[PDB]
Amino acid sequence: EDPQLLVRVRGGQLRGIRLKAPGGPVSAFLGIPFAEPPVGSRRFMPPEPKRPWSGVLDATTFQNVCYQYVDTLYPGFEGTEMWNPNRELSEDCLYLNVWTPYPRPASPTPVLIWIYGGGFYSGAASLDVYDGRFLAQVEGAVLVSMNYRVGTFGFLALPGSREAPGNVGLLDQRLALQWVQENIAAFGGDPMSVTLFGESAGAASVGMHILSLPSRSLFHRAVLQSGTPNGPWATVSAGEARRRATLLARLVGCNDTELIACLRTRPAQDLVDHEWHVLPQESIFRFSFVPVVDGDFLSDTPEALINTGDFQDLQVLVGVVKDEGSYFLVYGVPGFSKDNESLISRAQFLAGVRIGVPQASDLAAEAVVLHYTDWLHPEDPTHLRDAMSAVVGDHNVVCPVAQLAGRLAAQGARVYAYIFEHRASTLTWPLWMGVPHGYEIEFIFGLPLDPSLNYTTEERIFAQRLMKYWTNFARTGDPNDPRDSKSPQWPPYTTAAQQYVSLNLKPLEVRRGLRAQTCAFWNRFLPKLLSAT
Amino acid sequence: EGREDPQLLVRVRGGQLRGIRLKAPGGPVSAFLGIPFAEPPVGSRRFMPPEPKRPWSGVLDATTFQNVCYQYVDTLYPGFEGTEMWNPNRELSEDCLYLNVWTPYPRPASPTPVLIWIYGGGFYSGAASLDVYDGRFLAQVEGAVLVSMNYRVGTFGFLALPGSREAPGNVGLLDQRLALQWVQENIAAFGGDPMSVTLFGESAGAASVGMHILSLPSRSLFHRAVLQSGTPNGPWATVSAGEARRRATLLARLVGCNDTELIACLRTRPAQDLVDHEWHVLPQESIFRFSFVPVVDGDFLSDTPEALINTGDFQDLQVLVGVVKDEGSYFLVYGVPGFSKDNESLISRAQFLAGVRIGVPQASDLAAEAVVLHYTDWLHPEDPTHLRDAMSAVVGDHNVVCPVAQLAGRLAAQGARVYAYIFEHRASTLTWPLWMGVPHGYEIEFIFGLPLDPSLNYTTEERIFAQRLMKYWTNFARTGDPNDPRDSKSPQWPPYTTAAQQYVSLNLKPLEVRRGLRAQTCAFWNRFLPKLLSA
Ligand SMILES: CCN1CCC[C@@H]1CNC(=O)c1cc([N+](=O)[O-])c(N(C)C)cc1OC
Ligand SMILES: CCN1CCC[C@@H]1CNC(=O)c1cc([N+](=O)[O-])c(N(C)C)cc1OC
Ligand SMILES: *[C@@H]1O[C@H](CO)[C@@H](O)[C@H](O)[C@H]1NC(C)=O
Ligand SMILES: *[C@@H]1O[C@H](CO)[C@@H](O)[C@H](O)[C@H]1NC(C)=O
Ligand SMILES: *[C@@H]1O[C@H](CO)[C@@H](O)[C@H](O)[C@H]1NC(C)=O
Ligand SMILES: [Cl-]
C-alpha cells in the first residue's frame, strides 16, 4: 500500500486515494467523520466529537450529502443541477475532505478551509466546483471542506430550549475547524495558518466565525465571496426563528420538549416538504432556516457586532460578482425566465420590488423604485429588467458587503476588495443574467485547468491568476504576488480612498467607491425610513 | 406742438404722449417712458386692485422713467455693482404704476409682434427702469416693440386677507394684467400687433408669466410665453390663503395694528414702516423665501399652480423655458453661514447640514436627511469644495431647476409646444466671485443685447453671442419657434418632449442638444419628496 495515502489522526487510521490533476498527482482524503452522526434524538442538537475507530478507515470516496431540499425548477438543466446533491441524502452527513500535494508537503503548509453556500438550506462539499485538487497540485495548498447541516436540521431553533438551541450547522463548521487544529499537521498542514473562504451563505458563515469568540482561535484569515453575516437574509431574531419553528411543527402535526420530540419522529422529507411555507412574506433571496441571534454564538446582531468590534488582528478578502441578483428573479418574480430575455413592464418592476424587498413599507418600496428607475428611459423593458436584478443584488449582497468592508477597515482590519466581472464561456444561463451569483467559484478552484471542461486558454490563464491571489492571501494576508513587481498592485480597501480591483481577463484595474451613492441609500437612508414608517 | 419731432407724438386712450429719440449703437429708437396705466394706488387704495388711469389733458411728457414701486433696498454689499444693479434707480413711491415702450425709429410700417417684459425680484423688489431691461437693442436690431411695466411688490402688491374686499390679494398680478389690457387697446398706435403678444420674464417675473397662463382672464391678452429661471409652481412662488392671512396679521401687529379695521390701520402706516418689518413674518429661518407673494385665492388662481398644471389642456400654448447653470449660488450669501462673496466659501459638513435646513425650510428632519444623503459625494463626503457646490445645487434645484423641469414635463405631456434651454455662459464683466459660476439673473443682460453697447466692455464673442439670443427670443415671439427658417447651416433647437426630453446649451459654442433636465435628481424633488413629507 502507498504510505503517502496512509495517515494517522486522533481517531484512528485513514486511507486516502491518489487522484490525477493535469499537472500531477494529489492525495485526497474524502469522507472523514469529524462528528457523531446527528441522527435520532440528536436531530437539532449540537454536534459531538467523532468516536475513535478500529483498523483503517476508507477515506477514498465522498460521503453522503446533508438532507436538504432539491431544486426542480429546471429539471436536467446543468445550470441548476450543478448545485444539486451529487451523493445520497442522509442526516448522517458530518464528514470532511482533505486535499494535499502528492507526496505530502515536506514542510508545514498553509490551509484553506472551504465553507459551501446554498442559502443555509442546501449545499455539499462534494460538488465538482469545489474540487480541491487544482489548488493542491498547482499552489501546493492543503485544502479542507466539510459538510454542515442545512435547513431544519441545521438551523431550526426554539431559542432558549435545550433540544433546539439553534445554529448547530454553524457548530458543525466550528467542530470541523477544531478537527483541523488537532489533525491537519498529520497531512502536512500548518494549523497556525488557517484561512477560511466561502461563498454566499458560506461567506456569511465565515463572517459569523469572525464574530464569534470561540471560533476566533480556529483560524487566522478570512475570505467572504458574495455573502455577509450582516444584511437582510443571513440571520433571524429569536422571535422569528421560534415563530417559523412552531409553524413548521403545526404543518407536520406537532411546551418545547414535547414539540421537538414529535419533530424528531418525523421522516426527513416531511420537514423539507413544508420548509418553504413558513416565510412571513412572498419573497426571493429569503430563506426559512438560517442562523439565529441567540445571544450565544451571536451575542448580538451582526450589525451591532461589526459596529463595535476591534478587528485590528484581522485580514479579510471580500468581493462580489457583476450580477449578484439576476438568477433569484426566476425563482419568484413574474416576467422573469431563463428561457427568454425577460423584458418586463413598469407595473411588473414595481411588483418585483415588493418581492425583492419583502420587508419594505409602501413608502420604502416607492423610494427604491424611484431610485432605480432611469428617468431618461423610465419604461424601457431592458432597463427595467436590469434594474430589478440590481435592486436584488445590491440589497442582498453588494451593499451589505460594502457595509462590512467599511466597518472592518474603519475598525482596524486589513481589507482587500474585488468585483468579479468575467462571464464563463461555458455558462448555460442566458446572457441577460451576465455574471450570476456563484460563478466566480469555478475559477478560484482552478477548474479551467482541466482541458475536458472546454474552457478557453485565456480563461485558464485567468484561473491561475485567481488561485495565486487567493493562496498568496492565505500565506500572507496579502493577495499580491511578491515575485511580480509590475504595478498596478492590489491596494487595501480603506474608508478614505475606498479602493477595490476588478477581476477579469484584463490586468487589474483599481477603482474607487463600491456602489457608493446607491449603497448609501441602502445603508444610511432606508433604515431611517423603515424605522419611522 | 409744431417745433418738435413729429415722429415722437402719439395718442393713446388716456391722451397724448411725447416720447424721446434714443441712440442705440446701430441707429435711433423711439422710447415712451413713464406712461400711466392705472390710477395711483395710494391712500385708501393701498392693497386695492388697480383702477385704469383716467384720461389727462395736454401732452404727457414720456421721456423719463417714472417712480419705482415702494420696496426693500439691498444693503448687504454697499457700493458693490453685483447688488446695486438690481436696486431702485428712480425715486420710491406707491405712485408707481407706469409702463414703458420701445419701438423702432421711425415707427414700424406693418403691425409688429410685441414683447412684454415682467421683471423679477422675489415679488418684493424690482423695476422696469433698470439698465439690464433696456429695450433699445431689441427694438433697433430686431425691430421689436417692447413693453415693460411696473407692478406693486411686497406688502403693497401682495399682502392679503383672503376673502376680504379691502385686501383680496394678488393686486400686483392685477397691475400686470391691467398693463396687458393697455397693450391690447393702445399698442397699435405705436405699430405694435396686439394679435402677436409674447410675455417674457425672469425669476418672479417668470412665475408671474406662468400665473397668467393659469389665470383665465389673462389668456386673451397674450399668445406666447417665455419663462426664465422661474415657475408659478414650486416652493416660493405662492402661499396658501391661511399662510397669507397669517403673515398679514403678524405684520399688522409688528407695526401697531374684523379685517376692515385691521387693513384701515395698515393704510395709516408710512410705506417705509411696512418695508422695515417685511422679512420678520417668515415662518422659518430661510433663503429663497419671500414674505409677500401671490396667494391661492380661488379667483386669480382657482387652485394651486401644481393642480392647474397637472389637469390643464395646453394645446394652444407655446412656451420657452430654461435655467442658468448655477441657480442657487448667490442666495447662499443672504443667510447660509459660511458663505460670502469675499472668500471661496469652502464649508464643513456640519455647515452643509445646517444650510440644508435653511435652504429647505419646510423639510422635516427625515426629509432633510434625504436631501443630504442624495447630494453627498460618498467618495469625498467631507470635501469643502464639493460641499460648497452641493449647497448651491440644493438651493438651485429645489427652487428653480426642478420646478421648471416639472413644468416643462406637464406642459409637454398636455399639448403645449415647449422649448427648453440651459444658460451656461458667465459674463466676463461679472463682479460676483468665480465660485458662483453663472448665477441667477445673469442671462438677462444677454437677452436684451447689452453686449452690443461698446461702452460696456463685453468681448466680441459675447456681442455675437448676444445677437444669437435676441434672434431666438424674437423668432419665438414671431413664430412660436426660436429657429431661423432661413438657416440650415446652424444647428436646430428641437422641442422638449416626454419621449426624448431634449433641451439645448446656451453658450459661446453652437447649439448642443442634450437629454434630461436633471432627470434623476428632479425625480427625487418632484416625485419622492412630496410622498415623504405627507407621512
Ligand atoms: C444559494 C442558493 N442558490 C445557489 C445555487 C442554486 C441556488 C438557486 N436557487 C435559489 O437561490 C432559490 C431562492 C428562492 N428565494 O427566495 O430566493 C426560492 N424560493 C422562495 C422558492 C427558491 C430557490 O431555489 C429553489
Ligand atoms: C430675489 C431678489 N434678488 C434677485 C436679483 C437681485 C436680488 C438679490 N437679493 C436676494 O436674492 C435676497 C434673498 C433673500 N433670500 O431669502 O434668499 C433675502 N433674505 C432672507 C433677507 C434677502 C435678499 O436680498 C436682500
Ligand atoms: C418568459 O416566459 C415566462 C414563462 O415561460 C413568461 O411568464 C414571461 O412573460 C415571458 N417573457 C416574455 C417577454 O415573453
Ligand atoms: C468667509 O466669510 C464669512 C463671513 O465673513 C465667514 O463666515 C466664513 O467663515 C469665511 N469662509 C472662509 C473659507 O474663510
Ligand atoms: C471699460 O473699460 C474702461 C477702460 O479701463 C474703463 O475706463 C471703463 O470704466 C469700463 N467701463 C465699464 C462699464 O466697466
Ligand atoms: Cl422580526
Coordinates of N, CA, C and O in Angstrom, one line a residue, chain B residues 124-185:
Chain B
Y124 N -40.9 91.2 -4.0 CA -40.6 92.2 -3.0 C -39.8 93.4 -3.6 O -39.6 94.4 -2.9
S125 N -39.4 93.2 -4.8 CA -38.5 94.2 -5.4 C -38.5 94.2 -6.9 O -39.0 93.2 -7.5
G126 N -37.9 95.1 -7.6 CA -37.7 95.2 -9.0 C -38.2 96.5 -9.6 O -38.9 97.2 -9.0
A127 N -37.8 96.7 -10.8 CA -38.2 97.9 -11.6 C -38.0 97.7 -13.1 O -37.1 97.0 -13.5
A128 N -38.9 98.3 -13.9 CA -38.7 98.1 -15.3 C -37.7 99.1 -15.9 O -37.4 99.1 -17.1
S129 N -37.2 100.0 -15.0 CA -36.4 101.1 -15.4 C -34.9 100.8 -15.3 O -34.0 101.6 -15.7
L130 N -34.6 99.5 -14.8 CA -33.2 99.1 -14.7 C -32.4 99.0 -16.0 O -33.1 98.7 -17.0
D131 N -31.1 99.1 -16.0 CA -30.3 99.1 -17.2 C -30.3 97.8 -17.9 O -30.3 97.8 -19.1
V132 N -30.5 96.7 -17.2 CA -30.5 95.3 -17.8 C -31.8 95.0 -18.5 O -31.9 94.0 -19.1
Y133 N -32.8 95.9 -18.3 CA -34.1 95.7 -19.0 C -34.2 96.8 -20.1 O -35.4 97.1 -20.5
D134 N -33.1 97.3 -20.6 CA -33.1 98.3 -21.6 C -33.6 97.7 -23.0 O -32.9 96.8 -23.5
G135 N -34.7 98.2 -23.5 CA -35.3 97.6 -24.7 C -34.8 98.2 -26.0 O -35.3 97.8 -27.0
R136 N -33.9 99.1 -25.9 CA -33.4 99.8 -27.1 C -32.7 98.9 -28.2 O -32.8 99.2 -29.4
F137 N -32.0 97.9 -27.7 CA -31.3 97.0 -28.6 C -32.2 96.0 -29.3 O -32.1 95.9 -30.6
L138 N -33.1 95.4 -28.6 CA -34.1 94.5 -29.3 C -35.0 95.3 -30.3 O -35.2 94.8 -31.4
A139 N -35.3 96.6 -29.9 CA -36.1 97.4 -30.8 C -35.3 97.8 -32.1 O -35.9 97.9 -33.2
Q140 N -34.0 98.1 -31.9 CA -33.2 98.6 -33.0 C -32.8 97.4 -33.9 O -33.0 97.4 -35.1
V141 N -32.2 96.4 -33.3 CA -31.6 95.3 -34.1 C -32.6 94.3 -34.6 O -32.5 93.9 -35.8
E142 N -33.6 94.0 -33.8 CA -34.7 93.0 -34.2 C -35.9 93.7 -34.7 O -36.8 93.0 -35.2
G143 N -36.0 95.0 -34.5 CA -37.2 95.7 -34.9 C -38.5 95.4 -34.1 O -39.6 95.4 -34.6
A144 N -38.3 95.1 -32.8 CA -39.3 94.6 -32.0 C -40.0 95.8 -31.2 O -39.4 96.8 -31.0
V145 N -41.3 95.6 -30.9 CA -42.0 96.6 -30.0 C -41.9 95.9 -28.6 O -42.3 94.8 -28.4
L146 N -41.3 96.7 -27.7 CA -41.1 96.1 -26.3 C -41.8 96.9 -25.3 O -41.7 98.2 -25.3
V147 N -42.5 96.2 -24.4 CA -43.2 96.9 -23.3 C -42.8 96.3 -22.0 O -42.7 95.1 -21.8
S148 N -42.5 97.2 -21.0 CA -42.2 96.8 -19.7 C -43.0 97.6 -18.7 O -43.2 98.8 -18.9
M149 N -43.6 96.9 -17.7 CA -44.5 97.6 -16.8 C -44.0 97.5 -15.3 O -43.3 96.5 -15.0
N150 N -44.3 98.5 -14.5 CA -44.1 98.4 -13.1 C -45.3 97.8 -12.5 O -46.4 98.0 -12.9
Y151 N -45.1 96.9 -11.5 CA -46.2 96.3 -10.7 C -45.8 96.4 -9.2 O -44.7 96.3 -8.9
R152 N -46.9 96.5 -8.4 CA -46.7 96.6 -7.0 C -46.0 95.4 -6.4 O -46.5 94.2 -6.7
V153 N -45.0 95.5 -5.5 CA -44.3 94.4 -4.9 C -44.4 94.5 -3.4 O -44.8 95.5 -2.9
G154 N -44.0 93.4 -2.8 CA -44.1 93.4 -1.3 C -45.5 93.5 -0.7 O -46.4 92.9 -1.3
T155 N -45.6 94.1 0.4 CA -46.9 94.3 1.1 C -47.9 95.0 0.2 O -49.1 94.6 0.0
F156 N -47.5 96.1 -0.5 CA -48.4 96.9 -1.3 C -48.9 96.1 -2.5 O -50.0 96.4 -3.0
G157 N -48.2 95.1 -2.9 CA -48.7 94.3 -4.1 C -49.3 92.9 -3.7 O -50.1 92.4 -4.5
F158 N -49.0 92.4 -2.6 CA -49.3 91.0 -2.3 C -49.8 90.7 -0.8 O -50.1 89.6 -0.5
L159 N -49.8 91.7 0.0 CA -50.4 91.5 1.4 C -51.9 91.1 1.2 O -52.6 91.8 0.5
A160 N -52.3 90.0 1.8 CA -53.7 89.6 1.6 C -54.3 89.1 2.9 O -53.8 88.5 3.8
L161 N -55.6 89.5 3.0 CA -56.5 88.9 4.0 C -57.6 88.3 3.1 O -58.7 88.9 2.9
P162 N -57.3 87.0 2.7 CA -58.2 86.3 1.7 C -59.7 86.3 2.1 O -60.0 86.0 3.2
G163 N -60.5 86.7 1.2 CA -62.0 86.8 1.4 C -62.5 88.2 1.7 O -63.6 88.5 1.4
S164 N -61.6 89.0 2.2 CA -61.9 90.4 2.4 C -62.0 91.2 1.1 O -61.5 90.8 0.1
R165 N -62.5 92.4 1.2 CA -62.6 93.3 0.0 C -61.6 94.4 0.0 O -61.3 95.0 -1.1
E166 N -61.0 94.6 1.1 CA -60.0 95.7 1.3 C -58.6 95.2 1.0 O -57.7 96.0 0.9
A167 N -58.4 93.9 1.0 CA -57.2 93.2 0.7 C -57.3 91.8 0.1 O -57.0 90.8 0.8
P168 N -57.8 91.7 -1.1 CA -58.2 90.4 -1.7 C -56.9 89.7 -2.1 O -57.0 88.5 -2.3
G169 N -55.8 90.4 -2.2 CA -54.5 89.7 -2.5 C -54.3 89.7 -4.0 O -55.2 90.0 -4.8
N170 N -53.1 89.4 -4.4 CA -52.7 89.3 -5.9 C -52.8 90.6 -6.7 O -52.9 90.5 -7.9
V171 N -52.9 91.8 -6.0 CA -53.1 93.0 -6.8 C -51.9 93.4 -7.6 O -52.1 94.1 -8.6
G172 N -50.7 92.9 -7.2 CA -49.6 93.1 -8.1 C -49.7 92.4 -9.4 O -49.2 92.9 -10.4
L173 N -50.3 91.3 -9.4 CA -50.6 90.5 -10.6 C -51.7 91.2 -11.4 O -51.8 91.0 -12.6
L174 N -52.6 91.9 -10.7 CA -53.7 92.6 -11.4 C -53.2 93.9 -12.1 O -53.7 94.3 -13.1
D175 N -52.1 94.4 -11.6 CA -51.4 95.6 -12.2 C -50.8 95.1 -13.5 O -51.0 95.8 -14.5
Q176 N -50.2 94.0 -13.5 CA -49.6 93.4 -14.7 C -50.7 93.1 -15.8 O -50.5 93.5 -16.9
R177 N -51.8 92.5 -15.3 CA -52.9 92.2 -16.2 C -53.5 93.5 -16.8 O -53.9 93.5 -18.0
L178 N -53.6 94.6 -16.0 CA -54.1 95.9 -16.5 C -53.2 96.4 -17.6 O -53.7 97.0 -18.6
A179 N -51.9 96.2 -17.4 CA -50.9 96.7 -18.4 C -51.0 95.9 -19.7 O -50.8 96.4 -20.8
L180 N -51.4 94.6 -19.6 CA -51.6 93.7 -20.7 C -52.8 94.2 -21.5 O -52.9 94.2 -22.7
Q181 N -53.9 94.6 -20.8 CA -55.1 95.2 -21.4 C -54.8 96.5 -22.1 O -55.3 96.8 -23.1
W182 N -53.9 97.3 -21.4 CA -53.4 98.6 -22.0 C -52.7 98.4 -23.4 O -52.9 99.1 -24.3
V183 N -52.0 97.3 -23.4 CA -51.3 96.9 -24.7 C -52.3 96.5 -25.7 O -52.2 96.9 -26.9
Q184 N -53.3 95.7 -25.3 CA -54.3 95.3 -26.2 C -55.1 96.5 -26.9 O -55.4 96.4 -28.1
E185 N -55.3 97.5 -26.1 CA -56.0 98.7 -26.7 C -55.1 99.7 -27.4 O -55.6 100.3 -28.4

